[PDB]
Amino acid sequence: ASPFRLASAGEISEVQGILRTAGLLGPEKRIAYLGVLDPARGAGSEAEDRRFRVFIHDVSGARPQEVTVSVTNGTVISAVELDTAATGELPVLEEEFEVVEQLLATDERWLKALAARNLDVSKVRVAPLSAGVFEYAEERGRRILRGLAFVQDFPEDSAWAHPVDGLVAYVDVVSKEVTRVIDTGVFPVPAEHGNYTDPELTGPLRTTQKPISITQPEGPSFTVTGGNHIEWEKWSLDVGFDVREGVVLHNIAFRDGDRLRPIINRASIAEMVVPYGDPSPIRSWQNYFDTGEYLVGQYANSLELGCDCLGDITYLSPVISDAFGNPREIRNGICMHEEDWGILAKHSDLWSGINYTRRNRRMVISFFTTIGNYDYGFYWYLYLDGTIEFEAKATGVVFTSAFPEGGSDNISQLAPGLGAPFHQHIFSARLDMAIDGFTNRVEEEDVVRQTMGPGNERGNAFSRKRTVLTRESEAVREADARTGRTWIISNPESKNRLNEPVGYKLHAHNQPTLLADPGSSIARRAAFATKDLWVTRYADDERYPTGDFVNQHSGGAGLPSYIAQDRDIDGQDIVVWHTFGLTHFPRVEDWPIMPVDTVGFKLRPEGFFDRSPVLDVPA
Amino acid sequence: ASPFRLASAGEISEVQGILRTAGLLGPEKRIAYLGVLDPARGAGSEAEDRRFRVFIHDVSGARPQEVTVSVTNGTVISAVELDTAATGELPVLEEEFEVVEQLLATDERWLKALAARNLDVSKVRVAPLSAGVFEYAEERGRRILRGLAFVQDFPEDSAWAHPVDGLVAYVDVVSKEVTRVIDTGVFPVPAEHGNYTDPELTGPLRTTQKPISITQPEGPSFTVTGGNHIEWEKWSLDVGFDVREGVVLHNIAFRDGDRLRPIINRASIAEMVVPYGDPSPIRSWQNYFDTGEYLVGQYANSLELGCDCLGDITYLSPVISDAFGNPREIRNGICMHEEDWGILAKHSDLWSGINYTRRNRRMVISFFTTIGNYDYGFYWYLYLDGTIEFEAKATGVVFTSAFPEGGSDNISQLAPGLGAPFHQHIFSARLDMAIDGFTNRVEEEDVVRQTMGPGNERGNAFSRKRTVLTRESEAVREADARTGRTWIISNPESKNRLNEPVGYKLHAHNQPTLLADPGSSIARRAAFATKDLWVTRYADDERYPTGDFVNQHSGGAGLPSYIAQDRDIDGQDIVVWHTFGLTHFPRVEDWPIMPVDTVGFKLRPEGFFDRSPVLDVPA
């Protein structure tokens, strides 16, 4: 039955077949995105209709299309020609990755720039970098990538150690033309290698680590049915996968006694952006929307046992479409396991004589992706006590530049002559809430300090206040760590045994939000990133905080447009969008490969249950 | 040699003998605190002098003494009589715990109050609660405890479910007199039990948890020598234990190539306070300095294998003095183990074809203590990548009251008629820094946003600024989460290969600090808790942010007194004092036994190393 099951090879093949039969997938067409759509609200009672959404690119220069297909019924539901100058370009295609370097290698301007620096063109790697929207009128409606160069001394060399600063190129990847080559002057190309598997750099490998063995002799405590339905320690959910968003959780619910109680209808990382803070014209345009522009799911790693995921691991192997509509498996792309999480609850009582200790555990659902130099792990955690948590783990190799003679206010030094421009990695978690069902509301809760005086003669009292966000125009909120600000999602029509509305409290890390000037291109294209919390009324076409087409798309779409509708969110079907990020001033310790750093958020039950939900956990 | 070794049973007995011989430990004397002193600065070339500090109480009413003994030389170094009305009372004595209930049980005022509520005196437990300093002039110079009552229906009942509100009593535990009994009127005593091992409340215990087995077939990767010297994955340290502070870390250093590089000379939790935010006179005086008043180390639990600490565990069993100077072992009081910590670093490179993944681990040193209703786990972590972290885990049973008819702005409802007053748990970590040696300084680092305009035409630039804290008067700092504020401890005389001062960066959680009105008794007694970061010049007698004697002691000592000296801290031997805490508005899920919640901080290397320190970690 499972309408939330993962896409199968057969379903993608059938989408291909339906598109072909309908005249929409001839030899010049390429699929830039393909994913299954979620069931409509209230569709459970009706029969399944598995629908897929497809963005089709045309290599001959014709306009791209957005298409929705019914794989159940073998039909095309809708097909619409896109005007990309207006609504945005399609996501970067796998196959364009090589094109920037290939075109530049026979361009006379590019070759002149390389010859000035005594660089062999065969050794020069060029990254295919998203272009954004700046002052170049000719780029409007054209698929552009920008190119930054890095020297690779030999095939196994880390080119990131050898950035070619002072040089950037712009390329039309459809007409296959180089539009601009900018050379602001030569900088020394940093000479030290950054080869972290070279014994010369690592030194002798440590022989001091003794093994750690994590086993489950009776297997894991979770079950998987229907391919992707998880049941674990009162929790129930479906693990989806999408080529854009990556791992998506559906139908997060908790079995409280005899009742399956919904909590979150859909949880995803709906966008992530990496804005750079270096004003050099060589990099001042760079803002990588890894999710919206590159599609993080499509570059999910195959994860190796005992290396990437340790313990008793159950894998999912999601299937995606290649550029022609053939199915492609990402073998062992999703890890699922439970792990011990220390003490859950403990008390040694002075009067009863009873000593009591219980252990915690969490269910982990993760994937790891690679976008150029960056590698990111996306981890969702469900805990015994009802807590839900997301954690992003950032690693890879830092994006480099030259380090200016005389230093920099916007770049860190990593090695002689080698710099790393300052940047942020900013995520948007889209939480389609369903606290005990769909009738929800959000309150902002602040700690309230009280003045010494009447009613508080010793000046010890403190309190809190809650402010209901009633309409979307009032629902764009900022952090206030000093006042312990959190946000509670509750169901005003579902009360606990103490007659208080059931709820969940979102605890943010209160890291800095987008630092760019509010008048910048990135502040408009990533408006979501300027505020910590947004609440919208649910709509099926409001999927991403940046809109459907982010690549080379100005403001116009996404959260600021959604919120303008000023819809009722006080006891309605709502969606929370939480912005959270890492602000990275690279350190020498990040070079030549960066140790993991983390950011995330959690939600904890807040009067959702009638007492602790973990009293039945055994010793 | 090991001058940082744990106190032995023999040393404690020998201190007893030296005190007895000196005429300082007759039959009326009791030891309220005993601990080993750290070696003086510059020791190492000179032979060992193990010195112990002792606070000696007199049950006959004589003035207490502070005494320092050289156990090496068999001498009393110093003995001084204390005027407690001036400098503070000694910590609460174990033997005083029973006294409050016992004295109240034959007091006619107390009995009248219990009779008004139809409570059998034999069933009424009375907590021995620290008194603080308020308006009661007769308490000055007297050892007072206050008593709040909880009914126990039978021996194994959790009395916390049955608070007796409207009633409090004050008792002189030396003269054995009840000074005051206050009855502001009857409240219903909540009737539901809170017995978390009663099958009627737990229901059938889960049978769904399959085992998780964590083993190390070759044993652990760390060594223990000299009883408490740890070496693990380049780290070196000594694990101390004190009855006041609990686990204390000494000589944290990292072996970088051939050189042992100090980072932190001493790390401890030097105070922790639990202020309550209920303005009822029954509780408005309550502020529990678990460390300074009660001594958290003395109540450290014996930790059961597979239950409290999971995996291949190495235990220390610290020895403390009882009230008479006899040694007492806390068996398995400190857990030591290493554990896997997910991915350390990972990159799959598009150009080199090299795929690389390494796992992280951390060394864990912990203890768990119980202070009445509260139980707290203190965890120190050292990570492969040079990160140092502390985590506190708070659990136990919440402190209860009646829940007022018509609600409360300062108390949460947990069960019918049962409340939990709002409170905070606020810690002070004292980090005697030694970044590459003792010549250190602290900078406050904020993110700096930049305006769009000349030099920043696209409005993307961002930067940071660092402000050196030059003197103690400038070194009392507050959080600013919005600007990503951190604090860097560096050595201005030790530079990395890039000619930059080596450093470590402190990352705080930026939780609310002390909420009480600044004119309250607790704001003065816990002044440290009002600001996130303090920096002092090291002095051997500046051990606690609240001074040596916290019990019933007004302001006048501790950090505000130390900072007044306005000493140079710019390239000097300095101490960082970081305040961090949890603000707890109890939830129904916290009842009848609370799931663990956490707070802490970490320090990460910041140009301390010349490149990543984990390049030599094997696959």
Ligand SMILES: [Cu+2]
């Ligand atoms: Cu980064």
Ligand SMILES: [Cu+2]
């Ligand atoms: Cu608490």
Ligand code: NA
């Ligand atoms: Na919703």
Ligand code: NA
């Ligand atoms: Na120091």
